[PDB]
Amino acid sequence: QDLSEALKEATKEVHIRAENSEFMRNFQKGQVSREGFKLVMASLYHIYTALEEEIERNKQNPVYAPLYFPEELHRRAALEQDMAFWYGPHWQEAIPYTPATQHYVKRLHEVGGTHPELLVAHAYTRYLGDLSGGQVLKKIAQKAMALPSSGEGLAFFTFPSIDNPTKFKQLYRARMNTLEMTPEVKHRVTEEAKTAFLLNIELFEELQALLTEFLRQRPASL
Ligand code: HEM
Numbered sequence: 127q128d129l130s131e132a133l134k135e136a137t138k139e140v141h142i143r144a145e146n147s148e149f150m151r152n153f154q155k156g157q158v159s160r161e162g163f164k165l166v167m168a169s170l171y172h173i174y175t176a177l178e179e180e181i182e183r184n185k186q187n188p189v190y191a192p193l194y195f196p197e198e199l200h201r202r203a204a205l206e207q208d209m210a211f212w213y214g215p216h217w218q219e220a221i222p223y224t225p226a227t228q229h230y231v232k233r234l235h236e237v238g239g240t241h242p243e244l245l246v247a248h249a250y251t252r253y254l255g256d257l258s259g260g261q262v263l264k265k266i267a268q269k270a271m272a273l274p275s276s277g278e279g280l281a282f283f284t285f286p287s288i289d290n291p292t293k294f295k296q297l298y299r300a301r302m303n304t305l306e307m308t309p310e311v312k313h314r315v316t317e318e319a320k321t322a323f324l325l326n327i328e329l330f331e332e333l334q335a336l337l338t339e340f341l342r343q344r345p346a347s348l
């Protein structure tokens with residue numbers, strides 16, 4: 127079985143749970159305002175910054191290298207523009223860094239620094255979603271908050287260096303399937319993807335609440 131299929135099958139259940147989380151249900155209802163959208167995007171800024179920083183560190187490591195597509199995929203630059211749009215010129219010291227965001231970042235650094243063979247689990251969870259369902263989220267955001275079709279404020283959901291996200295996603299899947307894979311890695315990667323999904327749900331549920339030792343559970347634990 128291909129890694130791309132294993133990951134899809136292993137995360138289909140938690141995905142349904144994530145899209146039905148309180149925050150996401152509200153989002154899909156067009157009930158999230160500027161305040162809430164800013165919190166999520168600011169958090170993603172931190173998350174992608176750590177994610178892509180770890181990707182850089184391991185770009186020449188075979189366990190991830192085949193998926194090194196910064197020009198087409200990386201979102202940090204886009205999020206920086208979005209932060210300027212939503213938070214202004216001095217967004218740097220204005221954006222929040224929530225407990226759930228902090229712990230997501232913490233796991234990303236552990237993976238990138240200690241278990242790089244699992245980095246693909248995290249890139250899959252975020253990027254492949256961005257390239258697909260993220261396009262639906264983009265439409266919801268535009269309609270709800272009156273964001274122009276030109277893209278300002280939604281650079282994160284826009285991929286200027288790709289002709290068709292659906293097409294690129296197919297390519298990414300195929301390259302994911304070239305990574306050296308053994309039962310050990312496969313088992314662990316699919317398990318880490320579930321954790322990645324959970325870290326996202328914890329974030330979104332933490333933000334929802336804000337809007338309304340190693341074994342110690344995360345502060346934003348469900
Ligand atoms: C408002 C809630 C959400 C909506 C509307 C949504 C919807 C979708 C849709 C329509 C697809 C494409 C399925 C297809 O036709 O093949 C998709 C794929 C995906 N989504 Fe989401 N999604 C949501 C939340 C999330 C979250 C929170 C994550 C985790 C960061 C996520 C990660 C993914 C991944 C990794 C894929 C790619 C699946 C694959 O092809 O292997 N999604 N999503």
Ligand SMILES: [C-]#N
Pocket residue numbers: 254255256258259260261
């Ligand atoms: C899914 N995004």
